[PDB]
Amino acid sequence: AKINELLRESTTTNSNSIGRPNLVALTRATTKLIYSDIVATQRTNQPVAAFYGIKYLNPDNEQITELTEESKLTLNKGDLFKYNNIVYKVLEDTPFATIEESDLELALQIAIVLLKVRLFSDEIADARFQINKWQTAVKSRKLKTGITVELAQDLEANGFDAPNFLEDLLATEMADEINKDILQSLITVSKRYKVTGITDSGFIDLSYASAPEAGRSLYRMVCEMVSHIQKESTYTATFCVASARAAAILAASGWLKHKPEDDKYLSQNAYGFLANGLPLYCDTNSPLDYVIVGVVENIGEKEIVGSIFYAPYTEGLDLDDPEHVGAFKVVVDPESLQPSIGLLVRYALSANPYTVAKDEKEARIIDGGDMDKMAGRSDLSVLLGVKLPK
């Protein structure tokens, strides 16, 4: 029976000796429901997972002149200067003169067009990035289903109307647990928004002073966060996460559309595609009414750019059927007069230690899964708190 083959396949370690169809199937069932996309996944086959992530920061502090409002007035022909990490060269004496624009950046942008200044890259270069490698213990979550094997057995027989419901039920329970761990870690790890007084005297309120509109105010907020992202790290947000209220209807008024076009590329795990384009995942179960904007990017086949790293455990490719089986397993619950069902769920789930640990020697004192320490600084994700009506 399904339940049985699942127990006996789950008992064997190293999934390369014998094929395990029920488990592969159940793994495929589970992985379809996990919000992988919003985390930097790195499979692991060790009791301790090895993570790798890249990140940078504005250094330097010829001493290239940083551009300021009163700095631009002294620049002469041949002077070097930099703005937003990019260094320019002056082609004419005292530029920005004929430029009436009062906004610094804007002025500099039309300064580029008028050939007044020019970008500069004219011989060894510093590190523009920094690969970090750390380790966290892969956790072993044990979930009591309450389902006796007895039921799970007659459930097959008494289930002509819903063939592999057992599979769906389980896949659903493991996925939910991990999706919970993820959403939870992102809310705890992600940074806040710093717009004039911690988002103008408390993290933006859009209720009392707001009509039941199409929720434009919210969407605008999201765009600014996407900019603020590449503005502090050139990578380009890839995802969004919101509340069930803040998204299921609020932004769902012209700015969120459940699937733009028939299979136009979007995981059915994503609530809807945003007017902006980046996919949005609905939290539904978190008591916040908040929105988070992050990026999960990769170099090659490895996803090294993320707020949260996910390392499901693996016992190796089924080798009978190409599939990493190990992260999910079914066991028996020994705490019951009637044998129940237990789901073994193994995976690491860390943050980048180096989001706080300055030196490499400090990294072996603080842990990435130390959700207490990582709380606050991530940069690759930003959370916005929201207050809505009823």
UniProtKB/Swiss-Prot annotation:
Q: Name one GO cellular component term.
A: viral capsid
- Processing after translation: Proteolytic cleavage at the N-terminus by the prohead core protein protease gives rise to the mature capsid vertex protein.
- The annotated site for Cleavage falls at 9-10
Keyword annotations: Capsid protein, Late protein, Virion
What Pfam families does this protein map onto?
Answer: Gp23 (PF07068)
Quote the InterPro entries the UniProt record gives: CAPSP, Gp23/Gp24_T4-like
Q: Where is the signal peptide?
A: none
Q: Does the keyword Iron apply?
A: no
Keyword Repeat present in the record's keywords: the answer is no
Name the domain of life: Viruses
Q: Which family does it belong to?
A: Belongs to the Tevenvirinae capsid vertex family.
How does it associate, per the subunit comment? Homopentamer. Interacts with the portal protein. Interacts with the major capsid protein that forms 160 hexamers.
Its biological purpose: Capsid protein that self-associates to form pentons, building the capsid in association with hexamers of the major capsid protein and one dodecamer of the portal protein. The capsid vertex protein self-associates to form 11 pentons, building the T=13 laevo capsid in association with 160 hexamers of the major capsid protein.
State the name under which the record lists this protein: Capsid vertex protein
Q: Which organism is it from?
A: Enterobacteria phage T4
Q: Which gene encodes it?
A: 24
